[PDB]
Amino acid sequence: MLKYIIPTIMLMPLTWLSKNNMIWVNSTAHSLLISFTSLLLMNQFGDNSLNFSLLFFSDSLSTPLLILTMWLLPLMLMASQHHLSKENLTRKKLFITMLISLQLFLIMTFTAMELILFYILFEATLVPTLIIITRWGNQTERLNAGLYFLFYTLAGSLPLLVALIYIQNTVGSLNFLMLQYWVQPVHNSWSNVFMWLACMMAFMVKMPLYGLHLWLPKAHVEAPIAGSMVLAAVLLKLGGYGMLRITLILNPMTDFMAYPFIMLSLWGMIMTSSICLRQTDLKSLIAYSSVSHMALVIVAILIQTPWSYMGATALMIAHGLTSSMLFCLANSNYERIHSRTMILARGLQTLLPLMATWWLLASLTNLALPPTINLIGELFVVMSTFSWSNITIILMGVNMVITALYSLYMLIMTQRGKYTYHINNISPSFTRENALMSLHILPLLLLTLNPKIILGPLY
Amino acid sequence: MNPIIFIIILLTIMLGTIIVMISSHWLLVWIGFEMNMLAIIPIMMKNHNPRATEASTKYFLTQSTASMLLMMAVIINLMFSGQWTVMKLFNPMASMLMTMALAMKLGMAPFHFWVPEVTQGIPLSSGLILLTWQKLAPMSVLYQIFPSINLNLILTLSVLSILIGGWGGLNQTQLRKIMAYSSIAHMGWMTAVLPYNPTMTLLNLIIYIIMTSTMFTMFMANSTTTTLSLSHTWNKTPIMTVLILATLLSMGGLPPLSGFMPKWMIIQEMTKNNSIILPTFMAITALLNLYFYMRLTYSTTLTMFPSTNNMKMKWQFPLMKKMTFLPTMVVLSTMMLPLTPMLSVLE
Amino acid sequence: LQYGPLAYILGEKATKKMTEKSKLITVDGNICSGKSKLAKEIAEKLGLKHFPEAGIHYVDSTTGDGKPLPVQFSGNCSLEKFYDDPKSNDGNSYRLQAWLYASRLLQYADALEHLLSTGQGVVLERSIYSDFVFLEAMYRQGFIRKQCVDHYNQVKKVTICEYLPPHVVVYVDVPVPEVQSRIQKKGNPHEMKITSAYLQDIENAYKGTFLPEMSEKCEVLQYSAWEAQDAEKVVEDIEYLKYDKGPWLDQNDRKLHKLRMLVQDKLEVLNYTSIPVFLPEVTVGAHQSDQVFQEFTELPGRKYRAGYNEDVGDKWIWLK
Amino acid sequence: RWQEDPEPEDENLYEKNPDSHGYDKDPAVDIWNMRVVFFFGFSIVLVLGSTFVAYLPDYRMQEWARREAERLVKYREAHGLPIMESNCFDPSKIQLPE
């Protein structure tokens, strides 16, 4: 992985040694070049994962997440450089450094072969993320949002640290390849019930699981746009990726420990979808949309079927691009009217016709219009949960209906109707804003032509 | 104080600590503590004000009481073994008295009350010695007597210190009282792992000293002793706010910083011995320390607090403080996690 | 060696450089009372260093290239604005007074550093010991709130305690009616707006509080307007003073060393002039503070420590 | 209250630069920023990356598995053997308990 780790680090010298007026051009261009080379990770085999060294390996699960992560860095740079224009030069370079360091921790997190190396990097992403939210957020509440984000995560992570170290003691290793062959079954006992909880609660909080999700709408509403992009696109998927790996050693206890969390997700997804119908804040609506989508991922990981794992892998990638696009779309409105109130600026399709096309495409992927990968992921999950229990189609069906209602409600309220009279600073969409939107939707729609590369190890 | 007298007194503080660490005889261990206590008091009183007088008095009464319990243990040990060698003790009553005696010297809870008050009442340079160098001698004794220490007693002190340190720092606006309660909280981790692996007690001790020295040096560089006074630092020296942020996140134990290393190695040793509940309880309770570290980072680095007009005069003068070793200490405080396997040097 | 404990141990002790002629002298009086001229002549005759009364731009004169800085780098405090509109809503009156005290505190530290390190006495025009008379005049005329006075006293009580009072306090007693005529002759249009009641308040503070206090600890000389017109007669009085009272008798190398470590460290001197007490008159918002601080570092020779600014010709940066 | 700077007005990048792409205030930097985003983003990553992905060699051996299965079915049906046996492992190599 050094062909990706090292050039990612070299982005830091590049940013700091760039001319004062070229920090965005240089960092954006060279982070796109790194994104290009990440496609070499798709040298995947039918039987064996791609194991580079004792430290790093890349299978079909981590490969698409790595490519999503490295694609997101250039997009985040494009999305931030407007609202950071008045920033002090050094504080602009420190902002970019926080994003580069986040990418560094992320690509190492997704390829760590040892679970305790995964834990440290998994935890290391907190610091740059927290600093972005609290230093470069705009509102007073960004400070409270930082604390909720920090302490929700740590409340779960610290038990996970104890469980992993206990697992290394008893099994002798935490290398994920070794665990595949040395895994022993988990037999019922209160001791194992809490080993199971410690291994899964840290990841449940990151997804987040319904009930434990309150940190997420706070963080999104306060984060800067680049922070919201990485939060929704990648950092949520650290929970999913971690769960997909650790469940290997939790069998067969996962048979009955899953029930309380499937119930929370199946019911929680209807509850958070319905919350979206009455949200007044556009960013908060998108945040609650992520909770509903990630509920499906939690259910799919817990029912442990080949179809559900394929569906979860596609959902994580599809959600990553769609939710990131939606936050970017809402941000472009915010940079004009400087409010997140959804009902404030209406009828924008009249004033920004092409940006209204992006709003349409983003909404269609969010409601999972076939054959988007949003629909492929969501459909595969629904097929597998139906076999788990037929009655789940009722809850899946209702969520699909409510998901369409709030997706098109967001489209209709902001883009259609009459424009707000007194709002007269809706300038024409910039090239930067249109290119940012297209760099989200075009790769998302292109992946429909070749969806096998985002279906994960069980394809 | 004459500069030569200050150096002689400082070297006597170190000589007393050294004597404790090299002595094979309980009498010379006791002499080392007494010599150390004699020399430090004038450093506390160096500024001669009522708060320094109160601080030194409270310190003297506590340390002098601990020494009497320390010598009582030594004499009881002599009755029941007829020797003076510094090692395990041969009487459980002697072990308890010595263990309590060292707990009061360290300021562990519930013998902790003096630490916040004494630290607040003395300058920053003296506070640095109190919360760092003064831990060496009592810990070096615990390192040698642990095979005879009562496990329930030592783990009780460790648990209470982590709780009281964490809770005590939540209500503090004075930096010296924040460091004091942080020191109490960190003392608990060192003694919690002592029964299982003394090597991890040294690691925590060394890393705690580096981070604590870094913070005190940065507070001294700006002559700041309160939260609000420290909140002006972004307007004087922006770089120092970033070092404080990195150091404070490290003291909170956040990966990938160095301060995570001791919490990580202590949890490993405890789990190897089938101690699961205690490390879990300890790690969660350490979130209290992270909370009031995070408040300081907010008021210091991650926001910009109101300034005063006179602050503009300071822009025109450079930092004159010595800030000895601060560049090295801050890097060690933050960027040492990749070298964790180097802990075997302490074995 | 830069001064420090090592230099002191090796023989840099103040008692070696101080003589009977190493004296700190302060000339005080009302506005337009002839202080400057008398102070300059005393300094020239006795062989002392003359410090012109500390103004807004005193600190500028001791740093950088010595020129005044733009007024935004002093808070925009204006003496002219004080005379025109002494009740300005923007708190200019107290902001100026707080700034002036800090400038005097710095000048006093510089003066003490000169006296201790070379043994040459100095002459000052007013000082931190007499600056309060202007604060009392402002408060008695309603130009500042009582809160401003409380703030001023807090800053003074934790700063003036650290220093020794001047050896000699020269005072020129010019009565107010003559002062008003003197201002009218001087010709500064803003200064003509001074009310006589304000001038009387300056005189009441000087006679009421300052001189009775200084008498206990300093040699005080009071000269009418005409006596002050011949500095040679003033110098004659200074040359025959007893010097039998005050704290300077109690000083020794051990104490003057500690005093010298303070005054040479200017940030340490100015530590408490920016206590986190949020008065509207002296509090600055973060956005204003950040912008001005950034502009300050963009000034010539101000980005780096003195001697490391290549924009103004500093050399050997890579070896310094 | 305090001495604070008022909230600055909104800068419309189009006023000074009607041809602004929204990247930078400097028109020359603004053009270059647009060029690198479009060339490296669309022309390289999206166009070449899409072409690279389309021609990936037998991603996860799905084609080989289909060719191999054809070989086995041809053989087994010719020789009269079952297309696929229920037992994955030869039962002679297994030793059941009891």
């Binding site: - | 606006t173 939260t227 | 986190p276 949020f278 | 600055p8």
Partner: peptide, 19 residues
């Protein structure tokens, strides 16, 4: 608007004897 930063009311939360 512009980014919020602590004002005097916010700063006084940390100026008391205790939190």
């Amino acid at each position: 608007a512009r980014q919020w930063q602590p004002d005097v009311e916010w700063a006084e939360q940390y100026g008391g004897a205790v939190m």
